[PDB]
Amino acid sequence: PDEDLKAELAATEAIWLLRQGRPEEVWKLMQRLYEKGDPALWAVLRALLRSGDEIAILIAWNFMQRI
Amino acid sequence: PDEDLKAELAATEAIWLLRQGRPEEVWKLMQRLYEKGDPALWAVLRALLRSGDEIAILIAWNFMQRI
Amino acid sequence: PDEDLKAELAATEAIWLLRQGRPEEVWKLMQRLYEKGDPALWAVLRALLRSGDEIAILIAWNFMQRI
Amino acid sequence: PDEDLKAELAATEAIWLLRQGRPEEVWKLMQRLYEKGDPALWAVLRALLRSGDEIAILIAWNFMQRI
Amino acid sequence: PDEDLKAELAATEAIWLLRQGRPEEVWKLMQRLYEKGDPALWAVLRALLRSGDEIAILIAWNFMQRI
Amino acid sequence: PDEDLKAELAATEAIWLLRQGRPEEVWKLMQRLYEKGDPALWAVLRALLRSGDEIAILIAWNFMQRI
Amino acid sequence: PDEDLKAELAATEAIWLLRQGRPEEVWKLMQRLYEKGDPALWAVLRALLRSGDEIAILIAWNFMQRI
Amino acid sequence: PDEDLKAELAATEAIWLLRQGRPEEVWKLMQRLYEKGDPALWAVLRALLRSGDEIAILIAWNFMQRI
Amino acid sequence: PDEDLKAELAATEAIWLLRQGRPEEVWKLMQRLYEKGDPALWAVLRALLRSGDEIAILIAWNFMQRI
Amino acid sequence: PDEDLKAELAATEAIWLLRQGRPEEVWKLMQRLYEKGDPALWAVLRALLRSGDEIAILIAWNFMQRI
Amino acid sequence: PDEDLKAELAATEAIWLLRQGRPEEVWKLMQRLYEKGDPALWAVLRALLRSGDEIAILIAWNFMQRI
Amino acid sequence: PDEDLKAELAATEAIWLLRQGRPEEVWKLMQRLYEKGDPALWAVLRALLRSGDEIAILIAWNFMQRI
Amino acid sequence: PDEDLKAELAATEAIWLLRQGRPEEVWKLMQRLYEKGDPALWAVLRALLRSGDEIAILIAWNFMQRI
Amino acid sequence: PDEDLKAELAATEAIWLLRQGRPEEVWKLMQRLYEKGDPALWAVLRALLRSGDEIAILIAWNFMQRI
Numbered sequence: 001p002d003e004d005l006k007a008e009l010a011a012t013e014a015i016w017l018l019r020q021g022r023p024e025e026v027w028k029l030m031q032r033l034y035e036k037g038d039p040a041l042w043a044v045l046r047a048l049l050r051s052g053d054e055i056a057i058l059i060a061w062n063f064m065q066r067i
Numbered sequence: 068p069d070e071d072l073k074a075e076l077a078a079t080e081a082i083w084l085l086r087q088g089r090p091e092e093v094w095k096l097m098q099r100l101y102e103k104g105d106p107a108l109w110a111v112l113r114a115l116l117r118s119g120d121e122i123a124i125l126i127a128w129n130f131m132q133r134i
Numbered sequence: 135p136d137e138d139l140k141a142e143l144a145a146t147e148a149i150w151l152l153r154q155g156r157p158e159e160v161w162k163l164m165q166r167l168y169e170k171g172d173p174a175l176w177a178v179l180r181a182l183l184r185s186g187d188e189i190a191i192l193i194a195w196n197f198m199q200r201i
Numbered sequence: 202p203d204e205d206l207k208a209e210l211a212a213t214e215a216i217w218l219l220r221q222g223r224p225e226e227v228w229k230l231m232q233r234l235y236e237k238g239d240p241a242l243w244a245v246l247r248a249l250l251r252s253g254d255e256i257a258i259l260i261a262w263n264f265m266q267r268i
Numbered sequence: 269p270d271e272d273l274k275a276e277l278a279a280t281e282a283i284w285l286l287r288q289g290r291p292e293e294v295w296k297l298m299q300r301l302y303e304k305g306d307p308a309l310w311a312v313l314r315a316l317l318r319s320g321d322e323i324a325i326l327i328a329w330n331f332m333q334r335i
Numbered sequence: 336p337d338e339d340l341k342a343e344l345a346a347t348e349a350i351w352l353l354r355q356g357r358p359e360e361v362w363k364l365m366q367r368l369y370e371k372g373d374p375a376l377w378a379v380l381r382a383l384l385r386s387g388d389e390i391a392i393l394i395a396w397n398f399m400q401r402i
Numbered sequence: 403p404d405e406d407l408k409a410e411l412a413a414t415e416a417i418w419l420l421r422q423g424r425p426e427e428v429w430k431l432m433q434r435l436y437e438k439g440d441p442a443l444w445a446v447l448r449a450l451l452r453s454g455d456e457i458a459i460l461i462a463w464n465f466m467q468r469i
Numbered sequence: 470p471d472e473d474l475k476a477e478l479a480a481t482e483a484i485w486l487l488r489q490g491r492p493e494e495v496w497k498l499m500q501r502l503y504e505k506g507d508p509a510l511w512a513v514l515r516a517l518l519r520s521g522d523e524i525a526i527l528i529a530w531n532f533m534q535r536i
Numbered sequence: 537p538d539e540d541l542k543a544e545l546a547a548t549e550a551i552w553l554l555r556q557g558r559p560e561e562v563w564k565l566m567q568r569l570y571e572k573g574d575p576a577l578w579a580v581l582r583a584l585l586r587s588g589d590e591i592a593i594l595i596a597w598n599f600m601q602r603i
Numbered sequence: 604p605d606e607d608l609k610a611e612l613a614a615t616e617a618i619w620l621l622r623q624g625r626p627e628e629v630w631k632l633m634q635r636l637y638e639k640g641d642p643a644l645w646a647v648l649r650a651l652l653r654s655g656d657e658i659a660i661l662i663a664w665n666f667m668q669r670i
Numbered sequence: 671p672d673e674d675l676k677a678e679l680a681a682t683e684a685i686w687l688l689r690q691g692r693p694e695e696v697w698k699l700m701q702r703l704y705e706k707g708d709p710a711l712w713a714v715l716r717a718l719l720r721s722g723d724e725i726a727i728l729i730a731w732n733f734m735q736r737i
Numbered sequence: 738p739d740e741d742l743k744a745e746l747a748a749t750e751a752i753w754l755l756r757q758g759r760p761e762e763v764w765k766l767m768q769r770l771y772e773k774g775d776p777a778l779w780a781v782l783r784a785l786l787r788s789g790d791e792i793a794i795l796i797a798w799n800f801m802q803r804i
Numbered sequence: 805p806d807e808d809l810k811a812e813l814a815a816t817e818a819i820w821l822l823r824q825g826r827p828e829e830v831w832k833l834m835q836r837l838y839e840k841g842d843p844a845l846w847a848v849l850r851a852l853l854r855s856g857d858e859i860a861i862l863i864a865w866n867f868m869q870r871i
Numbered sequence: 872p873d874e875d876l877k878a879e880l881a882a883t884e885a886i887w888l889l890r891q892g893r894p895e896e897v898w899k900l901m902q903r904l905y906e907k908g909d910p911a912l913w914a915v916l917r918a919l920l921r922s923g924d925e926i927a928i929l930i931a932w933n934f935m936q937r938i
Binding site (some may be wrong): 709712715716720734735 | 825827858859866
C-alpha cells in the first residue's frame, strides 16, 4: 500500500517541521494535502494530536475546524 | 425495537470505518443519518466519543457543532 | 474489505437478537447466510461461541452439526 | 521420513487457512486427505484440536464424526 | 541565531506582562508580532500555553482561533 | 492601589452572584465592566475560572470568546 | 495471499530439514529459491536466524554473504 | 537543514519497506543512495542497525561490506 | 515598572549569550550597562551568579572587581 | 544408524584434539570429512560451536566460510 | 610523548566527526593515517570501538579488514 | 562548525598537558589563544575549571584575572 | 615440554606488546610464528582472544582469516 | 626521572617545614624554586593545596598570584 507509505512520509515531515519550529509550514502542508484531497491529511492530524505538543494539538484542532 | 438494532448496526459500521481509516465515510454516514432524521446519529456520536480515539472525538465534536 | 464489514454487521445482529431473546431468529439468520453461501456465517458462529451464553453455544454446535 | 514432512506441511497449511478465515478450505483439505488415504489427515486434526480456536475444534469434531 | 534571541525576549516580555496583570498588552504584543510576520509569535504562544495560568491559556487559544 | 480594591470587590460580587444562582447577573456585570473598559473584568474572569464551578467556567470561556 | 502460504511452507520445510540433520538440503532449498527469484527465501532466512541454532545461524549468514 | 529532512524520510521509507517485507527494495534504496552520493545512506544504515530486526542488521552489515 | 521589564530582558539576553557561548558579548553587555548607569547591570550579575555555570560565575566576580 | 555412531566418534575425536591443543589436526579432520562428502562434518562443526572455546568457534566459522 | 598527544587529538577529531555525522571523513582520516604510517590510526580505531556507536563499530571492523 | 572542532582540540591538548605536568605550557597555550583572539580560549578555561584539579582551577582563575 | 614454555613466552610477549601499544609488532610476531610453523601461534591467538581487549580480538580474528 | 625525585623531595621538605611552623621558609623555598626555573615549584604548590591546611592553601594562592 503505497498510500500507507505516503501517509508515513507526510507524518514524518510534519513532525520534523514541528521539531524545526515551522508551524506555518505544517499548516501549508495540511492545506496542500486537503486541496489535493489526499488521505495523508488524516495521518498528519493523527501524528500532531498524538505528539503531545500543545502547539501541534491546537494546530490540529484549528485545521479540523475548517475542513 | 428494530430502532435499537439499527442504532447498533450504525455504531458498528462507524467504528469499523474508523478502524479502516475512512474518516470521510464516517462523516458521510453521519451526514446521511442527520439528513434522514434518523436517531441512530446519536448512537454513532456516542460510539465515537467513547472510542477513545482522537480523530473520532474531534469528528464528533465538529459534527455536533453544526447540527 | 466490505466482506469484513458484512461479517461484523451479521455478528452484531446475531448477538443483538440473542440479547433480545429470539433464538429462532438467530437460527433463521444462520440459515439465510448458509443458503446464500455467505462467509459471514462463520463470523456469526464465532461470535456465538465466544459470547459465553449457553443457549448461543448450543445453537452454534447444533447448526455446525448440519452444514 | 518424508511422510513426517508432508504431515508438517499439511498442518501448517491448515492452520494458515484457519488464520486467513477459510474454514471451507480447511474442510476441503481434510476431505482431500481422507480421499487419498493420506495419514497427514491426523496431523491436521491434531493441529486443529491443539490450536485453541473454537471453530477449529468444532471442525475437527464434526470431521471425525463422519470418517 | 538572533531570531532565537528575539523569540526568547518576546516570550519573556509576554510572561512579564502576564505577571503584571496586563492581558490587553499581551494581546497587543501578539497582534504586533502577527502584523510583522514575526515567528516570535509562536514562541509567545508556547510560553503562554506552558505557563499553567488559565488566563494565558485562554488568551493563547483565542488568538490562535483568529490568525 | 484602589484599582486592586475594585478588582477584589468585583470578583467578590461575581462569586456571590454565582452562589446566589444568577448567571444572568454575572454576565451583565462582565458586560458592564467590558463596556466601561474596567480592568476588573480580568479579575472577575480569573475568579470564575478558579472557582471550580462548571457554569462559571463555561461563562468565562463564552465571554472571552466575544471580547 | 498465496505468497504468504508459500513463505510459511518454505520456512516449515527448512526448519524440518534442519531438525532432520540435512544442512545440505537447506542450502539447496535456499539456492533454488534464489534461482527462481522467490521471496520465500527471506522467510527461510528469517526462520533460520530466529531458530536459535548455531548451524542455522551460520548457514543464514553465509548464504546472505553471496546473494 | 533539509538534508536532515531527507535523511529522516529515507530512514522512514527504509523501515516501512522492512515492515512490508521488501528487503530487495531496501537494498535498491541503499544502492540508489550510494550511487547518488547522498549522505542519507548513513541514516538508513543507522535505522536498520537500531531496528532490532535480524534481516535489517544483516542487510546493513553486507551493504557496508561493499561500499 | 518598565525598569523591572528591562532588567528581566537584560538578564534573559545575558543568559542566552552565555548559552550561545559568547562571553565576550556578555562582558560587552555589562560594560554598556555600566557606562549608561543602568541598574539592569545588577540583574545581569545576579543571573550570572545564580546560573551555576563556572564561566559565568568568574565573569561576574571579575566584573564586580572593576566597577 | 551407524552414521550416527560415526558422527559421534568424529565429534569426540575433534573435541579430544581440541583439548590436546592440535587445531591443525582439527582442520585436517574437517578437510578429510569434507573431501569424502561425509555428513559427520556437520556434527564436528556443531560440537566445535557448542564447545564454548574461542579457538574452536573461530575454526568452525572459518571452515564454514570456505565449504 | 608528543606521539601520545597526536593520538589523543586524532581520536578526538574522529569522535567529533562521528558526532557531526561525517562517516566519510572518519574513513578519510583513517586512510590518511594509514597512508602516512602514523600509529594514531590505532588510537582512532580504539576510540571508535569503545564509542558504543554501531556505525563507528562497523567502520572500525571494515577498515581493519583492509589494512 | 570547525570552530567547535578547534575548541575541542584545544581543550584536549590543554588537559593532556595538564596530565603531563606542564602548567607552563598550559599557560603558554592560553596566552597564544588570547593573543590570536581565538574563542577556543574559553573552551580551554571551561575544561580547566571542570577538570577538578586544583592547579588547573588556579590557573584558570589567574588567567581570567588578567585578560 | 619446552614447547609449552615457548608458548607461554610467546603469549607473554604478545600481551606485553599489546600493553605497550604496538599492534604492528603483535602482527609481525604472529607472522613470524606462522612462517616458521611454530604451534605457539595458537597460544598467542588464545591469549589475544581472552585478553578482553577489542583491538587484540580484532587482530586475532583478522589473522585467523588469512592463515 | 630524577626530576620526579627532586619534585618529591621538594614537596616533602615543604610539608615538613609546614609541620615545623615555618611558613616563611616555605615561601623562601617557593621563591628559590621560581628563581631557578625549577618545575618542582608546581609539586610544592600541589602538595600545599592538597595538604588540607588553611595556611598552606593561602600560601599557595598568594604565591600563584605573583608568578
